[PDB]
Design a protein around this ligand. Structure first.
Ligand SMILES: O=C(c1ccc(OCCN2CCCC2)nc1)c1c(-c2ccc(OCCN3CCCC3)cc2)sc2ccccc12
Ligand SMILES: *[C@@H]1O[C@H](CO)[C@@H](O)[C@H](O)[C@H]1NC(C)=O
Ligand code: NA
Ligand code: NA
Lengths: 250, 28, 12
């Protein structure tokens, strides 16, 4: 996170860390949607262009963390992955359309004050909340600047940006499955995700029932906190049917 | 999940985090 | 810097 701030303890019980077994390193962000299901971006698991292609055995999932580097004893829970499910139509050759993937933990995790799942939106909540100017929140242990590492989990709240503006800021064909977000050059406020943040959750709090819903997934961006550029996120509700499908079927 | 989206240290305690007001105020 | 050692249970 660039231009963000230290998260409060317990602020994101659903935040998850994608940890590489060897070398022991931070790969991506993720979120806990159930006691056995973690949601993250697909590009985190597979991306031929950068020779990336991990399996269940290559990594660990770390839940309940606050500090990036320290193994938080008695607090955090590390689990193993049973099965990884990437979207059958993940366009990694072009625009990362449908940048989404599911992960099934080997054994359920137990919730605590630092570990709790986030809700997936329903059409209404999505309809009503996903509107330009409406602010969401991103979290992560990624880079503090485009070109260093924070000590604890960072947080930043960004406004959703008009579809026309998003399109006009990039050379990349953006699909209905994506939505960008961030401040405009003039708004005099900054903030954006960055390396090591992708995979993470972009949530919003419903003013109707007081719950937190994850509206997007940190997908891709060109640089970090650059003027006139915005971050793009996977439209989670738009692909909920695949999420339910996988969950139910498997 | 039945109690999803509800944080044990905030909502369940009726406490607000430092900047969640910012979000709620953007929802016109 | 770098990360801290995590229990070996988790690395097998
Ligand atoms: O999450 C990506 C991200 C993911 C994918 C992508 O691909 C762009 C191609 N197009 C395909 C679809 C859209 C654009 N670009 C950025 C993000 C960044 C990033 C930058 C460099 C990097 O490694 C390079 C360093 N390398 C040298 C060797 C191996 C890695 C890893 C992460 S910066 C950033 C800011 C906001 C939101 C997401 C990201
Ligand atoms: C990526 O990993 C899987 C599992 O080993 C393998 O089946 C596949 O051929 C690899 N390459 C790609 C681009 O899928
Ligand atoms: Na364009
Ligand atoms: Na920006």
């Amino acid at each position: 996170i660039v231009e963000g701030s230290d998260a409060e303890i317990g602020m994101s019980p659903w935040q998850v860390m994608l940890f590489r077994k060897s070398p022991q390193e931070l790969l991506c962000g993720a979120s806990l949607i159930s006691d056995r299901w973690v949601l993250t971006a697909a590009h985190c698991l597979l991306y031929p262009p950068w020779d990336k292609n991990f399996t269940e055995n290559d990594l660990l999932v770390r839940i309940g963390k606050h500090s990036r580097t320290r193994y938080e004893r008695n607090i955090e829970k590390i689990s193993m992955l049973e099965k990884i499910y990437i979207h059958p139509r993940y366009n990694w050759r072009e625009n990362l359309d449908r940048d989404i993937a599911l992960m099934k933990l080997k054994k359920p995790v137990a919730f605590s004050d630092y570990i709790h799942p986030v809700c997936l939106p329903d059409r209404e909540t999505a309809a009503s909340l996903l509107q330009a100017g409406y602010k969401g929140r991103v979290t992560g242990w990624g880079n503090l600047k485009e070109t260093g590492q924070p000590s604890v989990l960072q947080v930043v709240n960004l406004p959703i940006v008009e579809r026309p503006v998003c399109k006009d800021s990039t050379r990349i064909r953006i699909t209905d499955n994506m939505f960008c977000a961030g401040y405009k050059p003039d708004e005099g406020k900054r903030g954006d995700a960055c390396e090591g943040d992708s995979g993470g959750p972009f949530v919003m709090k419903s003013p109707f029932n007081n719950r937190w819903y994850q509206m997007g997934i940190v997908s891709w961006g060109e640089g970090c906190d650059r003027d006139g550029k915005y971050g793009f996120y996977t439209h989670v509700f738009r692909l909920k049917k695949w999420i339910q499908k996988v969950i139910d079927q498997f | 999940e039945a109690d999803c989206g509800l944080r044990p240290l905030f909502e369940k305690k009726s406490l607000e985090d430092k900047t969640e007001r910012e979000l709620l105020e953007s929802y016109i | 810097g770098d990360f801290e050692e995590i229990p070996e249970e988790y690395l097998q």
